[PDB]
């Protein structure tokens with residue numbers, strides 16, 4: 001519809017305002033194949049901090065319609081947008097759908113490189129050990145004691161990152177320690193990841209997602225990400241945003257007067273790669289208000 005061409009226009013406007021590498025050919029191939037799903041589903045536009053003065057630009061959508069579960073993968077495979085190169089990552093979505101009942105799934109795209117990531121959410125939570133028979137990076141099982149010790153063992157979602165040959169596991173925050181700043185401080189210390197500010201630690205006690213990143217090349221836990229929702233531009237803690245990300249909060253395109261935002265804090269090895277901020281605009285205004 002008009003809604004589909006409006007969405008592609010907004011993405012190019014973002015990528016050009018905030019200096020993001022993009023490719024109009026790849027956007028065209030994606031929108032031809034997924035454009036309707038972007039209009040008709042929970043849809044978000046992401047900006048991230050990975051370079052000092054150049055934001056990256058991403059876009060994602062989230063499918064809750066039970067009769068549609070699985071199509072994003074089939075569509076992507078048929079259209080050539082996702083071509084399985086025999087990689088270890090390539091068999092995981094088939095193994096996941098056989099093994100667990102799926103409640104939701106999603107697709108993340110990069111405005112220069114295309115389909116980047118597909119995620120699957122489980123109906124219910126499972127002991128993370130139930131996933132050890134999947135072809136996951138060996139670093140999952142070799143950290144099973146760490147996972148138990150830090151109460152990151154109520155598993156409910158998989159992110160399959162095809163650009164990085166990595167897997168993100170999402171863990172439900174079931175334990176009373178998950179509502180205390182000290183737990184997040186100690187988790188990041190135990191991982192020897194970059195320490196967070198005190199404002200962020202206090203925010204983290206709120207109800208958010210937590211994901212851990214495992215990769216097939218590395219025996220270590222590579223990354224950690226906390227996602228937190230915010231009702232509107234006012235609710236965003238702007239002390240934790242560099243000027244370029246603060247500008248995005250104020251000018252990010254949406255179809256609502258006061259769109260909510262989902263904020264993401266990535267952490268990695270201290271004095272190394274992996275520590276940055278992600279900012280997702282709730283483009284339809286219905287994604288964020290559906291807290292847990």
Ligand SMILES: [Mg+2]
Pocket residue numbers: 040041042062063064065068
């Ligand atoms: Mg839908």
